[PDB]
Symmetry: D2
């Protein structure tokens, strides 16, 4: 038997960092969960019990804290790159570092109109994520994403004209509820190393904001012919607004809300144009995925 | 053996309802999860296999939909009362109805500044809840609550002067992080029946808003001596702003963020006034509860 | 405003303890999650910021470890009593201690037939729990329970003869699937203090085993007329086998499995006696509760 | 912009099936959750709103039930292959089907020694899974797996000899707790189509049993030098017992249990050879992965 692939490291490392403006008194908090997996010349730890090659996962966790102490943690694309680079540069036999960061929302509270200097609210379970792969000799590949953005529209969605055969019961509709949890990922051009990543720093936050804004507007305004068709329009627009993105991926559940026929009770009318009360379905759900790139 | 207590019904009933303003085109959605448990003269279903006394839980679920079709679903205190009353009035042998409602957030999207007519976002996992107990002959007892409101402040919290003995390692502090998930419940004066509940309808939304506003402001502005002391101030204020509330309860986890000593590494300074990077603790946690009433 | 009730302490305290037989080499592990809430003369911490009355929740966590180091952790009824007693005896102004313990399963692995000396498997998410309330002057009240015991039977369940009215669609049946998650609690006679609890130590494990065995046998063998009727039979039997139990409570979800009509496709027969493929329903669910005591 | 990749279908489809031996009365239940994603000539649904190409996800769900009604559901490798084949054969423009199945445990109850004909228990959250990819012209690729198998050993684990530098605090140890949740996947030789899969049917259950048995024995008996070293031994053995497997993958969390120093309290000794009470750590955790194949 031989080792075809191997990676190891530390998952679920929770990190908070506070920044304090001494002049204004204003504090800003960042909270993340970080995963670091390493690859390289480590096969012998598996095959021969040779621990000499292992940077202990405990040490990986120490590094994460130390790096956050000494460096900016924002934007996460820059923090991830700095953290992954550190491991391939420091250890000769480590040749790749895979860094996943989930950013949690701590949104500044407004109190009596005005923004509070040191109080925050978790206004949503929506996450901003990054996957940074740092590979010795082959640069830095960044995938940036948003996830857990849960939306619903009550009308201006349709689904008609699909294939009908002997497995089909679904009825065509010109007016339905559409609700989803948005997972959207935008993949950056390969970067040559940390200097190139630093040179693009203003573009990471700006592109995350564009992505989120495009997803929201498009969902709200599209008179949607299908999830497929609506998601395409989102992906097309992002690609057009940021030239350094190579691909946009979307993965969208279709969270069904069913009509409830009440006509068995006193002829009550609650279907078609008379539908007011609906039953949210926990499962199953439609799952629609696309990766869009440049022609 | 004898039946000392018994209740039964339907849990986890998901309900969506849409309202459509035909004049303006504006739609408003409500989504809840509802639980109904009934009590009464039903012992024989347990002891003698006498199903004749059972209003089937399937039928309870039908009623929930029918009631939402025929009545307002907002505020949930009114919907809960209408639903519980229905069961004690309709069935001679049913003498109590326990209605729990969890309201989920569907917040109107703003798109290019302005509010969208039929698009919504789940801006937080915070819930508005009600427990309505409708007891034949003894009126309607409403407990209203908010839960899942997650907040954090980075400074202006202290914890010093506590009992020190041979079980104590904790150090006194004059500056720490305080973070919690707010569970707050306000209990209404007993209402004589549905007419009285209807007569107070404007007060339910207004009091939920006051409670939430007081919780937020107090947390942000209090230079906190303890969770205990901060929560008291919240409860006192709510009681003072709404005379029809008899008790306010708060249940607050103290979600700890620990300092990380990095001085073993190159003498790095990350404690006391030098603390910037902290480790959020998933468990254990402090759990602090209070019920406050009138003198 | 006044403090009507208050309690505080430490939740989610994870504890593992190993016992080592030096003679045989055999090790035995115990893992729990523990919650301790205290009450007493502590109002001033809330009203006057007087921390002098607070045994810090951090100290409560230290005590839990120390107590487990110095005392048996099994059965949990004895450990809970020892832990709660400690707080009311040690602190003059603390008058009640509420101890909740969840026991997690670490079941000895069998390897090539025979039991391994130091290897364990988590063979189920079923928990054994205790709630111990230790109140100064009024003894020790123990509620013991099992939870998360998930069972299913494919036949020998019926549900017919229920109330039918204009809210009823459910059809009567003489053969259905019954599946539930068993929550069962048995409440002990008040104990005068720790000496009395110690004198009953062999009865705690034996009664948990009886309860579990009765729940299982009764569920399997009863030709069930309803959840109500089946649960009664379980509760009756437990009360009869253990005289020191005052009440048995059961709380049982009815986790529905629906028939799927496939006859629209090639006249396929999958209902009534032809039902083979069914759709498990995640929600809603029936929720049936009983408390049974002595005549 | 262009569509680089696209897939769509139905997730979270819960399926139960019962088999009834009419001669013996013995019933056997199977419960799964199934996901089907399709690919093919469907780009126009995204780019041109052309729904004519879409087999509705609702129809995919119907097919799943119909297929389970007409075919065995066990072993899941055979069911998955039959289901994926159906879609590529039935629809000219569909060229790939990706079928994921999670099998849930319904273990026959033993009652008074002997196996009950129609009563089952969920004895563990451990799953048996399959991923079947059916690609028109390129056969059937099956990955089989177990997951959620949670184990712990209290001794006979070591971790010493690792790299020590200025990021290292971890101490070397010759005796620690090792606990993990086993995710193990074995990947089959490509199969030419359904006839070949059918010809190997007895090997799927037998290999799942071998894998599980090897994982268990190896974990229990290995005097472990590291997670890395122990997992290698498991993977090597599986490959040696089943020639039709091309690769074995393992992904193992290292769920840490920390020593608790109590010596600050009355000099209590709870470290090194005196360790009895430990603190389970919820996060972070070590994450160790390997893919092993043939030389
Ligand atoms: O938007 C949709 N896309 C689909 O592919 C589909 N299938 N059923 N319903 C659907 N809705
Ligand atoms: O606010 C606090 N209240 C408490 O009771 C406590 N105990 N430890 N830390 C604490 N913080
Ligand atoms: O066992 C049952 N008890 C009930 O009360 C009920 N209601 N619907 N189905 C039911 N099944
Ligand atoms: O088994 C281990 N493998 C590792 O790589 C490691 N790192 N810290 N502890 C460890 N234990
Ligand atoms: Na390197
Ligand atoms: Na009545
Ligand atoms: Na006392
Ligand atoms: Na095809």
């Amino acid at each position: 038997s031989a080792v075809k692939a191997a990676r190891y490291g530390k998952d679920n490392v929770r990190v908070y960092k506070v920044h304090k403006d001494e002049k204004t008194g204003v504090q800003t908090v960042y909270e993340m969960t970080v995963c670091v997996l390493l690859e390289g010349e480590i096969e012998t730890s598996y095959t021969k019990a040779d621990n000499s090659v292992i940077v202990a996962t405990d040490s990986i966790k120490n590094t994460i804290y130390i790096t956050a102490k000494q460096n900016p943690v924002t934007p996460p694309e820059l923090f991830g790159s700095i953290l992954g680079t550190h491991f391939i540069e420091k250890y000769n036999h480590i040749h790749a570092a895979h860094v996943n960061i989930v950013c949690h929302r701590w949104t500044r509270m407004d109190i009596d109109g005005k923004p509070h200097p040191h109080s925050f609210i978790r206004d949503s379970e929506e996450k901003r994520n990054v996957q940074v792969d740092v590979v010795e000799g082959k640069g830095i590949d960044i995938k940036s994403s948003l996830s857990g953005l849960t939306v619903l529209k009550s009308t201006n969605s349709q689904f008609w004209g699909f294939l009908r055969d002997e497995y089909t019961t679904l009825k065509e509709t010109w007016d339905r509820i559409l609700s989803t949890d948005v997972d959207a990922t935008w993949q950056w051009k390969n970067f040559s190393g940390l200097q190139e990543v630093r040179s693009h720093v203003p573009k990471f936050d700006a592109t995350w904001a564009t992505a989120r804004e495009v997803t929201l507007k498009t969902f709200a305004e599209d008179n949607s012919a299908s999830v497929q068709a609506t998601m395409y329009k989102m992906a097309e627009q992002i690609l057009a607004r940021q030239q350094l993105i190579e691909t946009v991926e979307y993965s969208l559940p279709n969270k069904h809300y069913f009509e409830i026929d009440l006509s068995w009770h006193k002829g009550l009318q609650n279907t078609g144009k008379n539908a007011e009360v609906f039953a949210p379905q926990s499962d199953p759900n439609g799952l629609i995925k696309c990766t869009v790139g440049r022609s």
